[PDB]
Design a protein around this nucleic acid. Structure first.
Ligand SMILES: [K+]
Ligand SMILES: [K+]
Ligand SMILES: [Mg+2]
Ligand SMILES: [Mg+2]
Ligand SMILES: [Mg+2]
Ligand SMILES: [Mg+2]
Ligand SMILES: [Mg+2]
Ligand SMILES: [Mg+2]
Ligand SMILES: [Mg+2]
Ligand SMILES: [Mg+2]
Ligand SMILES: [Mg+2]
Ligand SMILES: [Mg+2]
Ligand SMILES: [Mg+2]
Ligand SMILES: [Mg+2]
Ligand SMILES: [Mg+2]
Ligand SMILES: [Mg+2]
Ligand SMILES: [Mg+2]
Ligand SMILES: [Mg+2]
Ligand SMILES: [Mg+2]
Ligand SMILES: [Mg+2]
Ligand SMILES: [Mg+2]
Ligand SMILES: [Mg+2]
Ligand SMILES: [Mg+2]
Ligand SMILES: [Mg+2]
Ligand SMILES: [Mg+2]
Ligand SMILES: [Mg+2]
Ligand SMILES: [Mg+2]
Ligand SMILES: [Mg+2]
Ligand SMILES: [Zn+2]
Lengths: 49, 46, 180, 57, 88, 235, 29, 95
RNA sequence: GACAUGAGUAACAAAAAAGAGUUUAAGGUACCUAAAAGGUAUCUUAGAGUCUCGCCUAAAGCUUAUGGCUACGUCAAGUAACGGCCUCUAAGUUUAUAAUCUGAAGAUUAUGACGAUGAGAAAACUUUGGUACCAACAUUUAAAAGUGAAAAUUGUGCAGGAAGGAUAAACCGUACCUAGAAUCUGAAACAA
RNA sequence: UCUUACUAUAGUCAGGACUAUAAAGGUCCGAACGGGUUAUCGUUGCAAAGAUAUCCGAAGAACUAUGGUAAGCGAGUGAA
RNA sequence: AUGUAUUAAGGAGAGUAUAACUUAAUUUAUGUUUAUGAUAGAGGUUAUCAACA
């Protein structure tokens, strides 16, 4: 890749929409792994009960 | 002397008799598994 | 944006699969394309993977699994296992595709075929001898290919016998300080 | 066998009168001069003449 | 083997598996003429659209290397599996 | 008892030189037959439409060919048209995923089915003389006699190129008693028009030369409906 | 130079041993 | 039977109703007469974007040396949710 | 554990059976030739084929099973020209549920689930109980004739002959071997 | 997964003869198949139960296939 | 083998840079000390020429 392209900054943070389609997160990590540390509030609420 | 007692043997009867599900699902089969597991066996069944 | 088939709803944005495009068989028509796909790949995936990624329409797909020989964990030692089988798929292209013919052996110099060939024959001859030993046999001395060292001792033999050269005692057998 | 055969009585059985006999019925071949058995055809001239009659005829 | 060859579309979708249209595999000397992998630092300045398009350039690039490895082995072209293992 | 022929130059009845061995062309070896010197042969004792079209199916992988009068082959064709060419080389059944229509021959006369029943006979008699009596390929071309019995049986199965050469020969008047000839005998004779439909345009190039009474068309009726597209050379 | 290491290396490494043998033959002449 | 009997059983060994899949996923449901109805809600499609005009390649020139990020004094440098929210305000305030 | 003796002995004998040519690859020799090469002949190893003879033949042939330490380019919506998966159930199984019995383990009954060696729409295009039933035996029936199935028709004997469900094409199998000539079981290349 | 009995689902038994039947018989001769009567060989065998010939049953209390049930303080099965 | 300290669920299948281990199978950052350490260069695959926390 040319040096002019590798240096181009195109990332603009967002707050109301995810950085990528929410479906992509299922591909980056395994939703059901026993190594999952980031759980949802609805899950922890069901685990504490 | 020894006899050809395995002539005409099928591999479906091998899974029904000495299979993994024939052992985890029975009280006496869970002992065989744990024994072979405690000894180090790789082939717990079949 | 209208695919010839019906597309699924589960969207895959970052597929991790590797698709290999293999050469067809000699007698196969030019509308069949053979690929090596993951074992979990199915006919619907290849049809959708070939159109959205490479823009290739297919009127049908065929798939067959190739098993792998059972082996030992460490070649000649270890427990008996079986590698993961291989899946091949043959797609019926809507547009014919013809492969190029392999280059002639004399025109493969870009790949260093000369050196590669010498190395291939060496391993071919070591695998053959190790099979002759697996039958409980050895190559008789009369059948061993004469090497370069045995061809130079026959040219000297004919030069000493003929009388061209005169034999003389060796001078490099050992570096003694006495020199007698 | 009641006993083990000793090194002497086994060496008698193996070599006393069982020495390989040297072939002495060798003569040269008239066409080429190579050594051949007596009353026999040269093996190097047979193949050469046998092949010479297959090409031209 | 002596039939008139059919005309294959120049812009065929399956020409993307080939490095060179005459010899599927690329010469080892010209197969090593590549740079280095993107560092996480460089990839932190790119939007989903760039990282989503840059991902598929690798998916198609890995398919191009698997295809060459099969052809080179099957057709006995020669060496080049040590140069592709670094590229892949 | 069988009698094999020798690969010797011979005269042909066809208008073209089917093989390099052919000495002459369009030679009368026998007086015209009953239906040969007839402007309109008819479907006398056969079903309506029978003989108007002839199909050829081939194994897309191995090259085995089957001729049929109907648009679909059955288990009879595989038994009555495929001789024993070695162990594991004669399939036990017709596998739908391997057998495809190779070509289709349609005559101009839409009710003269007797002309197709003759074209069908010479094609089936030429194919029997290709699996048997292949003296022209024993020492030349494919060199079937210089091959093992295993490899020899595979080449004898690959009758697809041979079948396309039997079409250019039969459709050009090859054979004795071929009804594709039309003798006026007022004595001038000519060949009847025909049309060959090809699923693959490149398949029609196995014949070194085609006659002047045959028209070539791409695509067989009913193949597009099956989602099978024809292969075109020009693209 | 083993028989099973000759093909496990890139062309640059292999083509660097031939110039070594080549340059070794120019001094022997 | 001595040894092959002891290997793991595969579908290429036995035929008497023994079935075993390759984890290709369920694409539908079975009918009562032995057919299969493909539920296209389970079928998966691959979203490949238009790559015409894309200038990034999978390699970066070796002239540009590999350098990491410093994030001095911030233990959770790249994962700090504060430097992601504060950075958002200046650059993109609306979204 | 290594190495002797018997001993270079027994054995390589299913009453099929061999004979003479030809050729390919790699390599070993001799001559030709001394520019290396190439050529002629021959031998070793691994193959191939031709002509003649004989052997098995309701096989020692072909197509496929059980099975496999033989090898991994074996390709199907369905029928003609396909099985599994799937639906249904038999003999049975049940660390399923309920009840009951019981030194514990457990056992019994009912229900559910599961369980083929069986039953499963259409297609050369397709999606009540003799008004019975589909055990054995016998008879008849796709109209030129004969033969063998399939299914059905009628009948005979007693030994008196299932269950249940119904009624746009995924996944898995597909290579080779069938035991007289290299593959299954018999410790093996076993006259079984 | 041998083997004994039972169990469910299935398959097989050329041809001829006699008998009251077209089909009603633990009928007859005899292949496949199932047995193992006599002799010979074999006995570190081809075989830890085989080969050859001979002999017996061969529509039945028959034989065969794929599953199932019943065995080890008590004894499962047993035309014993 | 004994002693001391610490800890209180174990195995297998397949795959993978064959010292590197999970389809991301050699992730990304902090602090300190760096030859008076700890116990003024070359080198991102010709790599990992840095240990501890
Ligand atoms: K109890
Ligand atoms: K009898
Ligand atoms: Mg992942
Ligand atoms: Mg984690
Ligand atoms: Mg016993
Ligand atoms: Mg049995
Ligand atoms: Mg087959
Ligand atoms: Mg198999
Ligand atoms: Mg099998
Ligand atoms: Mg089932
Ligand atoms: Mg003696
Ligand atoms: Mg003696
Ligand atoms: Mg002897
Ligand atoms: Mg030679
Ligand atoms: Mg007989
Ligand atoms: Mg074996
Ligand atoms: Mg399939
Ligand atoms: Mg199917
Ligand atoms: Mg059920
Ligand atoms: Mg069944
Ligand atoms: Mg045997
Ligand atoms: Mg036999
Ligand atoms: Mg055996
Ligand atoms: Mg049994
Ligand atoms: Mg009787
Ligand atoms: Mg009697
Ligand atoms: Mg008995
Ligand atoms: Mg004796
Ligand atoms: Zn001589």
């Amino acid at each position: 890749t040319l040096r002019i392209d590798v240096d181009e900054k195109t990332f603009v943070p967002t707050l109301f929409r995810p950085p990528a389609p929410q479906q992509v997160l299922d591909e980056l990590r395994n939703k059901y792994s026993i190594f999952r540390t980031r759980h949802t509030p609805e899950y922890i609420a069901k685990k504490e009960q | 002397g020894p006899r050809p007692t395995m002539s005409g043997a099928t591999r479906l009867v091998q899974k029904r008799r000495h299979g993994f599900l024939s052992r985890v699902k029975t009280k006496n089969g869970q002992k065989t598994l744990k024994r072979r597991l405690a000894k180090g066996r790789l082939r717990l069944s079949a | 944006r209208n695919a010839p088939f019906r597309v699924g709803k589960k969207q895959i944005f970052l597929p991790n699969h590797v698709i290999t495009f293999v050469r067809p068989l000699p007698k196969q028509p030019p509308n069949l394309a053979t690929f090596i796909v993951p074992l979990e790949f199915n006919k619907l995936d290849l049809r959708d993977y070939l159109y959205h990624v490479y823009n290739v329409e297919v009127t049908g797909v065929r798939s067959f699994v190739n098993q792998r020989m059972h082996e030992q964990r460490h070649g000649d030692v270890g427990n008996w296992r079986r590698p993961k089988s291989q899946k091949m798929m043959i797609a019926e292209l809507a547009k014919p595709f013809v492969w190029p013919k392999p280059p002639a052996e004399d025109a493969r110099e870009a790949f260093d075929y000369a050196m590669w060939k010498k190395q291939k024959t060496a391993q071919e001859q070591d695998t053959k001898f190790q099979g002759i030993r697996a039958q409980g046999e050895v190559v008789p001395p009369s059948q061993f290919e004469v090497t370069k060292d045995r061809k130079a001792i026959k040219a000297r033999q004919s030069k000493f016998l003929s009388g061209e050269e005169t034999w003389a005692p060796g001078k490099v057998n050992a570096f003694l300080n006495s020199k007698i | 066998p009641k006993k083990k055969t000793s090194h002497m009585k086994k060496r008698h059985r193996q070599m006393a009168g069982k020495a390989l006999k040297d072939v002495t019925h060798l003569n040269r071949c008239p066409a080429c001069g190579n050594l051949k058995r007596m009353h026999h055809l040269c093996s190097t001239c047979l193949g050469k003449l046998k092949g010479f009659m297959d090409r031209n005829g | 083997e002596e039939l008139p060859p059919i005309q294959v579309d120049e812009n065929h979708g399956l020409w993307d598996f080939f490095y060179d249209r005459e010899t599927v595999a690329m010469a080892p000397l010209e197969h090593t003429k590549h740079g280095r992998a993107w560092t996480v630092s460089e990839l932190r300045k790119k939007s989903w659209d760039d990282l989503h398009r840059l991902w598929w350039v690798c998916v198609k690039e890995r398919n191009r290397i698997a295809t060459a490895n099969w052809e080179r082995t099957k057709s006995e072209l020669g060496f080049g599996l040590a140069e592709a293992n670094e590229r892949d | 008892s069988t009698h094999p022929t020798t690969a010797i130059p011979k005269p042909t009845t066809a208008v073209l030189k089917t093989s390099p061995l052919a000495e002459e062309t369009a030679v009368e070896l026998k007086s015209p037959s009953r239906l040969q010197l007839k402007s309109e042969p008819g479907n006398k004792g056969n079903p309506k439409g029978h003989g108007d079209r002839i199909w050829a199916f081939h194994h897309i992988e191995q090259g085995q060919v089957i001729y049929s009068t109907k648009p679909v082959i059955s288990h009879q064709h595989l038994i009555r048209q495929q001789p024993f060419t070695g162990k594991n080389l004669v399939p036990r059944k017709i596998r739908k995923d391997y057998w495809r229509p190779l070509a289709m021959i349609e005559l101009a006369g839409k009710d003269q089915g007797a002309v197709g029943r003759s074209v069908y006979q010479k094609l089936r008699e030429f194919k029997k003389r290709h699996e048997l009596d292949w003296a022209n390929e024993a020492e030349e071309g494919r060199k079937l006699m210089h091959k093992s019995k295993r490899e020899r049986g595979q080449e004898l199965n690959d009758q697809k190129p041979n079948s396309v050469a039997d079409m250019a020969a039969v459709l050009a008047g090859a054979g004795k008693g071929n009804l594709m000839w039309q003798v006026s005998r007022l004595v001038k004779r000519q060949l009847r028009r025909a049309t060959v439909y090809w699923t693959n345009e490149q398949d029609k190039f196995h014949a070194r030369e085609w006659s002047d009474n045959v028209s070539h068309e791409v695509g067989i009726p009913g193949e597009a409906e099956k989602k099978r597209m024809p292969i075109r050379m020009s693209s | 130079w083993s028989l099973f290491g000759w093909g496990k290396q890139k062309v640059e490494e292999r083509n660097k041993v031939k110039e070594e043998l080549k340059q070794s033959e120019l001094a022997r002449t | 039977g001595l040894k092959y009997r002891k290997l793991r059983l595969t579908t290429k060994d036995v035929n008497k109703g023994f079935y075993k899949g390759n984890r290709t996923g369920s694409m539908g449901t079975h009918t009562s007469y032995g057919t299969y109805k493909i539920d296209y809600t389970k079928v998966r499609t691959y979203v490949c974007p238009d790559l015409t005009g894309f200038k990034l390649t999978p390699f970066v020139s070796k002239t540009i040396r590999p350098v990491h990020d410093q994030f001095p004094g911030d233990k959770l440098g790249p994962k700090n949710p504060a430097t992601y929210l504060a950075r958002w305000k200046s650059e993109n305030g609306l979204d």
